[PDB]
Design a binder for this molecule. Structure first.
Ligand SMILES: O=P(O)(O)O[C@@H]1[C@H](O)[C@H](O)[C@@H](OP(=O)(O)O)[C@H](OP(=O)(O)O)[C@H]1O
Length: 231
């Protein structure tokens, strides 16, 4: 589990999951969408934070594995593993410092779907993550993004919906994985391949969603990115 939720998905495979929330500060749960519904991750928003802050766990009853934190404004998020914030203790061993696993920037709509940018660490030819572990808040994923120093990173965006002449709607082909309209419905792709669906999220019921991820993402990145879409 601890291993699994941090491993990039296998080449050529789509890992399909079911994300549920309590029917505020609801809990969220992620399971593999197999007939043996194995539990992966859970998260919940902390009430006593100045900004949106979700703790993520590999124990659905409580194992702290990561955190989703928004900026003050609320339109930008960073995903961290379980390591220490360097600003809270400069003498801490570098290996114990938190890494940044993803960032999400949402465009703000006029007072519907929001356009999204997702930035993650780059991968080696070994197909493992090249970790980003800032020694202070003068570096990080959002920082590199705004500076446009994207060498060690991967940039992704939500795929624009297209006209479905059969359903008379602007939508995406979710392959039956998404059955209800929602501002949370999305596909995340790279510019180089609009058909390789890195992350798909969408509603199947009042409190249930599907979340399907592919390489280079792991389950923790996928889950946290999906959580950022709630609000
Ligand atoms: O306030 P508004 O303008 O009506 O926007 C909706 C509101 O946030 C609902 O709470 C939310 O449903 P949930 O509480 O179920 O998340 C819905 O998501 P939806 O598009 O998935 O229905 C939003 O579109």
């Amino acid at each position: 589990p601890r291993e699994f939720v941090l491993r990039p998905a296998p080449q050529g495979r789509t890992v399909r999951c079911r994300l549920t929330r309590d029917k505020m500060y609801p809990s969220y749960f992620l399971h593999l969408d197999t007939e043996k519904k194995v539990f992966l991750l859970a998260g919940r928003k902390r009430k006593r934070s100045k900004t949106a802050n979700y703790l993520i766990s590999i124990d659905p009853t409580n194992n702290f594995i990561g955190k989703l934190r928004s900026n003050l404004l609320g339109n930008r998020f960073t995903v961290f593993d379980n390591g220490q914030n360097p600003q809270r203790g400069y003498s801490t061993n570098v290996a114990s410092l938190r890494q940044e696993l993803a960032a999400v920037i949402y465009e703000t709509n006029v007072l519907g779907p929001r356009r999204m940018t997702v930035i993650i660490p780059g991968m080696s030819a070994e197909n493992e993550r090249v970790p980003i572990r800032p020694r202070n808040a003068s570096d990080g994923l959002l920082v590199r993004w705004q500076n446009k120093t994207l060498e060690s990173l991967i940039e992704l965006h939500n795929k624009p919906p297209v006209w479905n002449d059969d359903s008379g709607s602007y939508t995406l082909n979710f392959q039956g994985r998404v059955t209800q309209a929602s501002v949370k419905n999305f596909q995340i792709v790279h510019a180089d391949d609009p058909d390789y669906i890195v992350l798909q999220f969408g509603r199947v019921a009042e409190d249930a969603f599907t979340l399907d991820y592919r390489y280079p993402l792991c389950a923790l990145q996928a889950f946290a990115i999906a959580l950022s879409s709630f609000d």
